Design a protein around this ligand. Structure first.
Ligand SMILES: OC[C@H]1O[C@@H](c2nnc(-c3ccc4c(c3)Cc3ccccc3-4)[nH]2)[C@H](O)[C@@H](O)[C@@H]1O
Ligand SMILES: OC[C@H]1O[C@@H](c2nnc(-c3ccc4c(c3)Cc3ccccc3-4)[nH]2)[C@H](O)[C@@H](O)[C@@H]1O
Ligand SMILES: *Cc1c(COP(=O)(O)O)cnc(C)c1O
Ligand SMILES: *Cc1c(COP(=O)(O)O)cnc(C)c1O
Lengths: 810, 810
């Protein structure tokens, strides 16, 4: 049908049909009389997987023979989403499978919808890990992702009575055809116990053992025949575990609970023992696998020449003291040599400055669970502080601020300080964030070791986030500039030559229109909701958090409602305002925000005076597969965090690639996006970081804004008095109280500029030709935000390896 | 190589090789460079499984079109053992796979040893269920086995310091290539709740739900292209289960524990709640599946024409009140009609008369767990007793003895009484056992409903228990009488014509000798134990229980030792005495018996005066795959239970088929075996049932035997004084105490006859030609003990269906 989806050759189609029927009969044990759509999905998935196998085996043999430096990306989250379509895209099989299935009487798009998301992450951090794997494979790097195979991923969100309810995400119920269990590379992981000091060093004894069993998933590069591996560990009890009899077998559950469920926090730390066990489990199993692979090529001088370990935040920070433990206690290296190897091997990426998100583990927990690691941490700390004291003699307060050990009520280990001390490179995730790290929270570290600190601005994969989710747009671009841009996104700059081309303008606007119709139809089918597809699609999708300021969007929505009610017969640009995202289960204020959004919808959507001029829709169960549907359909991307809080953002980038304009603050990567497109082509508003600092010095007084802005005061009075909750008039009083007295994120301070800037959006939308020209200028300058660019920078500036676009043979 | 293993045609071998390599690459994702023997095993298993699929699909379609009466065999145990070799035997693929693997550089016998037993049973009852499935398929019956997929089967036994230690049998760790998950036929099962009585009947409300997910395993018939199904249910929590958040997900374990582990008792009942949940789980899920299949062909008049349910002991007895519940509460049949359907549909097999093995559930447990089932049971009881009272007016004591409800301290439901009341047929498992049921424990029931009571003597499958485990014997038989006997075992009578044929005598004795050499070598390899393969192999393998009298065998062994020590220079026929079997983990006396056996070995095996004249070996981890090795190698089969206690036995039959002579009491099926072979060809000794009764009336006084038999007294003094436990002299005093004061099984009363009869065994073994002639007379008359005979009788006399030897097309 369309060119970027590849060739449907007669031979290839005939073979795909034959293999589909083979898997239906032999693998699934069904005939066509009794097969359901789910059986058809599995038959297709097995058929496509068969095409990965030879390449997977060949890629791994190639790494064994060439022995390149290997890159190990360690993360507690990999937010993969669905695999079927992505695999077909990367192997150039999409049109062939469409034709084969069409010839068998089946619709491939309906089969794709059956697959479960692999939801092994919370949001941006986990999704970044997934983009990165895709880019590493596309760039020919010998890379492995290592994590945990959670039995239950991020919860499924249902909305009941306008409230979030959580359901378990039993993603493995029907089987996962993409993974291969590897019970033969099972490894032991130790917990608890005590330390004995012999004449021949320290020994960690009397430990409890849990087994780590690996499951491997293929990660195909884009049309280069490289298939890398994601290795996820699952927890198993040993067979002599607890070994009256029946209870001992049932208690195997205690050990296997380590890999049971993903902690559903985003930007929020809690010191729970189970989470610490998860973190050590992944590190201990991973490092053993790494060492085994290194020895099969005790000269550890060469270890950093053959191995890089990238820490995705502090969540796998125990890799530092575990590497030391192995080298000192088991391999018998002297401390100083071990430390040299460790620092040269490890690098740390920081993803947040919010203080409540930073991991600070109580010492008593580490003492019980990981007594040897605590000894090693103290020794790292004493040696590190000895260096600080030599460089800044007499600066006793600096010694307290830089310590890995925080004093107090409960002594804690600051894991971020541990990661900086033990890594040769430390990076933030957007230019403004990296600068903030050097000026504020890690200023002391930067002064001691300035060479360590870098920036690596985030990116997204253009395979999933353009070709897969928006083939119509990919196609109209390819018609003009060819297909090379899919793996070299900077080539999108060539589209600036088409900003005045009437045909290109028309085709861009047509693609958006088709995507909006398709999305409006999806909403009627699966959720019984009617929307005007000629309205401006105003979209804010991301996790629910005070810092992301869904509440600021709420206040705009109410403003627009109130203005319609005041002058009902005046024209206004119609909007469909869509907000979606999950709240962490124990985060009360986030749950109240969801309820506010649905309550505003209840009033607005049923007011006959409003008509179809304004609709407010809460999009339930926001996840990767839903992002692939709504992002292509958006007109306006809402990126409105308080300046200084969103370390990067990556949703922002996905919207820019797919032909939405952005309204946003100068925060995170929004800064760089505006720089690349031109500020004239972005809707920028609100306090800059320096303005937030100035208000903090004077003291933020929300009352002042209430007193001076009548439109704002009317909204607060409506919230307080029960206008949006007529049966429970005090329902929203905690939201009102927070906004008026303890708002850390200064929602009222950006309200006036936000409303004014939204009026400019509406004005431009009235002129479709000019809106579309601005869109072209955004898509054309989105190339910097390819994760291929990001990964090339990590490779050259941190890992010491050279990317390659060279194909392996098929 | 050998004829009964089938043809190795060039085409077939070429195809098997190609498919093996295909599964190695695509299914296992390995190349030959990195493949282990376990990978080779899986590649073969997938290759053989592919040959089952078409036949499986075709068989199930055939049943759908013909709509025969369906037979549902309900069991809490299916002791399947390994599947690979059995599948090849039943599809005639054994020589072809041997040749294919040989051509690939692999030894198929080494690959077979990798497979785990499916150990989903305790011993004889579970193994009988497995034999039965094999026979039902071979006889063309539309039969389904239904049970539970335990995550952990019967424990692995290790012997440490001579004591039994238990390890979890994590049989699924590497995957089970034989099963197919069917998550689409998942069904709900209800627990707890309460009953409401409306105007429109009783309603069972406020229940907790557990899901039952089925896994299907193929059961191939012998060369008839029929493949039936074994459907095993696995427990899953619903997704809203308990739905702070993290704990709710971890607590899904509570529901999933239902299918976690097999209770490891043999002939011993304990009233644990988890076991009751297992029993209801299997019944509730099964009956829904049965009803669904019946409706897809509300006229329940025809239900017993299309359905038979066979209850394997009382373990699935809740099927009776559950069928009633469905018909009355959900389908709205009147009680009397429902009851007619139930009784005509259900039939009950009893497997034991020991009072401690009979299920008697406390009422308070049923009241909490299954309140509606308890109401239905009481109503069954009241109606049943109304009939008793009409037939035997004034016989108030009969009403108390026959009640389903036992009065007392704790009121209990007698499940056996429930099964008799609600079934149209009740059978025992050997002629003597069936007679005992009519004269003793169910006498009252027999007087009320004599037509219900039948016998169905047990049997074993000759596919597993001759062709598979002893191909050399199968072959020498086939050379004389052809191959038809494999599915018509009565044809073994033709071998009586060869009792004087010198060539046949030689070949029979040669096969035994080869099997003994192979077994002696297995023992040196895997267990570092040396044995004389010219010695008489004296074997007692079965679960450890007082009633089975492993202790009587111990006393003989000590007697032989003591006689050697007394006259060291006299000739005695050398023996290797092998005892094996598992003890239930909480059965203290069974555990002490194992320790006694190993302690006797410690002394005997290291006494230089004994030499290789006597060796005592405890065979560790006795299970189906070990039975297949040791049974072909045995000379003497020890079947020495106290008369009246072993309902049938089935090990006895396996030994008779494989060319061992039997020493045994007139108990269980030993009676019928002696009748078929002739008493002159069996080593019968000891009290008959009537003799045991006479001693019970007078009172058993063990002291009398101690006082009169000097050889017995010497042994008791050696046990008491520490001769076999020099470091812990009192170690065995509980065994001594039991034998002297509270032996329910009268070990001393059969001692003198047992020793005398053992001397006759030794005398015959000295004359190999006459020993072998007697063996021929046993093998030749073993045909009655085919489970094909047993199943044909169930089919005609209970189920109302006609077996068929007709082949389906391939
Ligand atoms: O660079 C990728 C993205 O990382 C996000 C992030 N920054 N920190 C986290 C974070 C995620 C999960 C969890 C924590 C922090 C703490 C925690 C504790 C327990 C379980 C999960 C989590 N996520 C940033 O907010 C976002 O601006 C950035 O684009
Ligand atoms: O007909 C097949 C065989 O059934 C055996 C049996 N008779 N009762 C049981 C039995 C097995 C398991 C369990 C129970 C009884 C009670 C129990 C409770 C809990 C768990 C398992 C078990 N087993 C008989 O002892 C044997 O003579 C016969 O050949
Ligand atoms: C990209 C993405 C995110 C991150 O969005 P932000 O707006 O950067 O927070 C979160 N969740 C999903 C499912 C995503 O695809
Ligand atoms: C046949 C068999 C049994 C039953 O043996 P009995 O001597 O009848 O108790 C028990 N366990 C295994 C493994 C068997 O194969």
């Amino acid at each position: 049908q369309i060119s970027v989806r590849g060739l449907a050759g007669v031979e290839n189609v005939t073979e795909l049909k034959k293999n589909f029927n083979r898997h239906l009969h032999f693998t699934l044990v069904k005939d066509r009389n009794v097969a359901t759509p789910r059986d058809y999905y599995f038959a297709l998935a097995h058929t496509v997987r068969d095409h990965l196998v030879g390449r997977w085996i060949r890629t791994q043999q190639h790494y064994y023979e060439k022995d390149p430096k290997r890159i190990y990306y360690l993360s507690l989250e990999f937010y993969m989403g669905r695999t079927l379509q992505n695999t077909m895209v990367n192997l150039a099989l999409e049109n062939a499978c469409d034709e084969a299935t069409y010839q068998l009487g089946l619709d491939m798009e309906e089969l794709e919808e059956i697959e479960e998301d692999a939801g092994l992450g919370n949001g941006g951090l986990g999704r970044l890990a997934a983009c990165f794997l895709d880019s590493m494979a596309t760039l020919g790097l010998a890379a492995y992702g290592y994590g945990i195979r959670y039995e239950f991923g991020i919860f499924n969100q249902k909305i009941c009575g306008g409230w979030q309810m959580e359901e378990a995400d039993d993603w493995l119920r029907y089987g996962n055809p993409w993974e291969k269990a590897r019970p033969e590379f099972t490894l032991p992981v130790h917990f608890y116990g005590r330390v004995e000091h012999t004449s021949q060093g320290a020994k960690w004894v009397d430990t409890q053992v849990v087994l780590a069993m690996p499951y491997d998933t293929p990660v195909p590069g884009y049309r280069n025949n490289v298939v890398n591996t994601m290795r996820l560990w699952s927890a198993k009890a040993p067979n002599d575990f607890n070994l009256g009899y029946i209870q001992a077998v049932l208690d195997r559950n205690l050990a296997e609970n380590i890999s049971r469920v993903l902690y559903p926090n985003d930007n929020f730390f809690e010191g729970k023992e189970l989470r610490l066990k998860q973190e050590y489990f992944v590190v201990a199993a991973t490092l053993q696998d790494i060492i085994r692979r290194f020895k099969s090529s005790t000269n550890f001088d060469a270890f950093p020449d053959k191995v890089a370990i990238q820490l995705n935040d502090t969540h796998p920070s125990l890799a530092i003291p575990e590497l030391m433990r192995v080298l000192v206690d088991l391999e018998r290296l002297d401390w100083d040599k071990a430390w040299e190897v460790t620092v040269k091997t490890c690098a740390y990426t920081n993803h947040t400055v919010l203080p409540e998100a930073l991991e600070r583990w109580p010492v008593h927990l580490l003492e019980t669970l990981l007594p040897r690691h605590l000894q090693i941490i103290y020794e790292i700390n004493q040696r590190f502080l000895n260096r600080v004291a030599a460089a800044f003699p007499g600066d006793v307060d600096r010694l307290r601020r830089m310590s890995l050990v925080e004093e107090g009520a409960v002594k804690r280990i600051n894991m971020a300080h541990l990661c900086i001390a033990g890594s040769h490179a430390v990076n933030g995730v957007a230019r403004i964030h990296s600068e903030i790290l050097k000026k504020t929270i890690f200023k002391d570290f930067y002064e001691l070791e300035p060479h360590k600190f870098q920036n690596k601005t985030n990116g997204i994969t253009p395979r999933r986030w353009l070709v897969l989710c928006n083939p119509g747009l990919a196609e109209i671009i390819a018609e003009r500039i060819g297909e090379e841009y899919i793996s070299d996104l900077d080539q999108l700059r060539k589209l600036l030559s088409y900003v005045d081309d009437e045909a290109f303008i028309r085709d861009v606007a047509k693609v958006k229109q088709e995507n909006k119709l398709k999305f409006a139809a999806y909403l009627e089918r699966e959720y019984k909701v009617h929307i005007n597809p000629n309205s401006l699609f105003d979209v804010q999708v991301k996790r629910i958090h005070e810092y992301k300021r869904q509440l600021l969007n709420c206040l705009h929505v109410i403003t627009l409602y109130n203005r319609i009610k005041k002058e009902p017969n005046k024209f206004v640009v119609p909007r469909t305002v869509m907000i979606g995202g999950k709240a962490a289960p124990g985060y009360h204020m986030a749950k109240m925000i969801i309820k506010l959004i649905t309550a505003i919808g209840d009033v607005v959507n049923h007011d006959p005076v409003v008509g179809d001029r304004l609709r407010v829709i809460f999009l339930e169960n926001y996840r990767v597969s839903l992002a692939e549907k709504v992002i292509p359909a958006a007109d306006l991307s809402e990126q409105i965090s308080t300046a200084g809080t969103e370390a990067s953002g990556t949703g922002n980038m996905k919207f820019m690639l797919n032909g939405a304009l952005t309204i946003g603050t100068m925060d995170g990567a929004n800064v760089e996006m505006a720089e690349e497109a031109g500020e004239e082509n972005f809707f920028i508003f609100g306090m800059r970081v320096e303005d937030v600092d100035r208000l903090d010095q004077r003291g933020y007084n929300a009352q002042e804004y209430y007193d001076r802005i009548p439109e704002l005061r009317q909204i607060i009075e409506q919230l307080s008095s029960g206008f949006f909750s007529p049966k429970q008039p005090d329902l929203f009083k905690d939201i009102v109280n927070m906004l008026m007295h303890h708002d850390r994120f200064k929602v009222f301070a950006d309200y006036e500029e936000y409303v004014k800037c939204q009026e400019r959006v509406s004005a431009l939308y009235k002129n479709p030709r000019e809106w579309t020209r601005m869109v072209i200028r955004n898509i054309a300058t989105s190339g910097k935000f390819s994760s291929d660019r990001t990964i090339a920078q990590y490779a050259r500036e941190i890992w010491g390896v050279e990317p390659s676009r060279q194909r392996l043979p098929a």
